[PDB]
Write a protein that binds this ligand. Structure first.
Ligand SMILES: CN(CCOc1ccc(C[C@H]2SC(=O)NC2=O)cc1)c1ccccn1
Ligand SMILES: [Zn+2]
Length: 258
């Protein structure tokens, strides 16, 4: 009886195994656009993905992860609210059963169809496992997806999903350029939070882009054909793999833009 997104093991149950689920800096949150404060001291975000080396795509039973070589400073996030250098380790998405839900963060209570998370770790902690034990260990760049025109740069991801349908399947996934998943603007909101799955560690500086990317209905329909289950188990469609908004508590969301 392990955690997941069902009636019996979903977010409302996670606190039993992971009491930090009720902590002081949990994610995601609703972004109240009128109460976020413009912070003119926030720097532009530096996204340096020119040298990114993708390796593999994995269905881990909760999402699919596109994994990168993080053994050198090749794909790094710097600037914005961050001190020092954060290495890209993986990206994944959260999405819904319906276009009207799927994002983890919300904007004035609006749910997007999906949310992309580019996960980066602070190089001053040496490895990802050490970084998650630190309050400034990770930087996650969150990007909303809305359904409209196709995202050309997403299609290579969409087309490999047939090969990783079930939990524990992986495939080669080299030479994927994550710059093709970014919107035009790097305007962002930022706040201190957590991993949005168990172990729910309070180690993340969240950077959520204001501008969504557009993906087509066909692209997100292919996400929804993935399975939570392993091969030869009853089919459970991988849909609604999002944690809902958590209490903001004693936090301020800052805007990089007026
Ligand atoms: C290091 N580790 C393994 C898991 O740590 C995680 C890091 C990120 C994620 C993905 C989350 S965070 C986000 O933005 N969206 C997600 O889905 C999940 C687990 C540990 C460390 C201690 C105990 C157990 N495992
Ligand atoms: Zn995530």
């Amino acid at each position: 009886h392990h955690w997941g997104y069902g009636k019996h093991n979903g977010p409302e149950h996670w606190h039993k195994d992971f009491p930090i689920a009720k902590g002081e800096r949990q994610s995601p949150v609703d972004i109240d656009t009128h109460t976020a404060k413009y912070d003119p001291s926030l720097k532009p975000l530096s996204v340096s993905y020119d040298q990114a080396t993708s390796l593999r795509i994995l269905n881990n039973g909760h999402a699919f992860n596109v994994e990168f070589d993080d053994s050198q400073d090749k794909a790094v996030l710097k600037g914005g609210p961050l001190d020092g250098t954060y290495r890209l380790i993986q990206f994944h998405f959260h999405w819904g059963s319906l276009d009207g839900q799927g994002s983890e963060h919300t904007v004035d209570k609006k749910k997007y169809a999906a949310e992309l998370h580019l996960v980066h770790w602070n190089t001053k902690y040496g490895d990802f496992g050490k970084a998650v034990q630190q309050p400034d260990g990770l930087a996650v760049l969150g990007i909303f997806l809305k359904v409209g025109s196709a995202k050309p740069g997403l299609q290579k991801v969409v087309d490999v999903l047939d090969s990783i349908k079930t939990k524990g399947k992986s495939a080669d996934f080299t030479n994927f350029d994550p710059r093709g998943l970014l919107p035009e603007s790097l305007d962002y909101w930022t706040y201190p939070g957590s991993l949005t799955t168990p172990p729910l560690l309070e180690c993340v500086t969240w950077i959520v882009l204001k501008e969504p990317i557009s993906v087509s209905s066909e692209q997100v329909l292919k996400f929804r054909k993935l399975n939570f289950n392993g091969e030869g188990e009853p089919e459970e469609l991988m849909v609604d793999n999002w944690r809902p908004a958590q209490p903001l508590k004693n936090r301020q969301i800052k805007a990089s833009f007026k």
